[PDB]
């Protein structure tokens, strides 16, 4: 939802694309840029956090520097590798609604459930 105003503006400045919503830890900055060069091709835009707080793992409450991020996929063919990259990131990843208000509401509901 934070990326719904940040990543959207970045994509508008840089400009069919896929949603790369999910997560990327604080140590995934190199993999987001140095790696996945064939798929991203440098034309995509992304918004990522610096893991301001320890985010609990999807199946573990121990948490780590698991920053969450949302990016844009360069089509389904590139989204196939983008999903693999996101899985390799292994942070607290969960897709959210495109709308900023809807994403914030989903985050609030998940926090209340937690």
């Amino acid at each position: 939802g934070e990326f719904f105003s940040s990543a959207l503006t970045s994509a508008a400045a840089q400009q069919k694309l896929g949603f790369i919503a999910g997560l990327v830890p604080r140590e995934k900055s190199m993999s987001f840029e140095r790696m996945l060069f064939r798929a991203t091709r440098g034309n995509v835009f992304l918004r990522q956090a610096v893991v301001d707080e320890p985010v609990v793992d999807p199946v573990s409450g121990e948490k780590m520097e698991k920053n969450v991020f949302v990016v844009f996929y360069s089509g389904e063919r590139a989204k196939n590798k983008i999903l693999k990259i996101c899985d390799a990131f292994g942070a607290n990843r969960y897709p959210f609604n495109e709308e900023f208000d809807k994403q914030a509401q989903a985050i609030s509901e998940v926090s209340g459930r937690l």
Binding site: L8, A11, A12, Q14, Q15, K16, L17
Partner: peptide, 8 residues
């Protein structure tokens, strides 16, 4: 973005 408007 521009691409979204193109695919719109």
């Amino acid at each position: 973005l521009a691409a979204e408007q193109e695919a719109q």
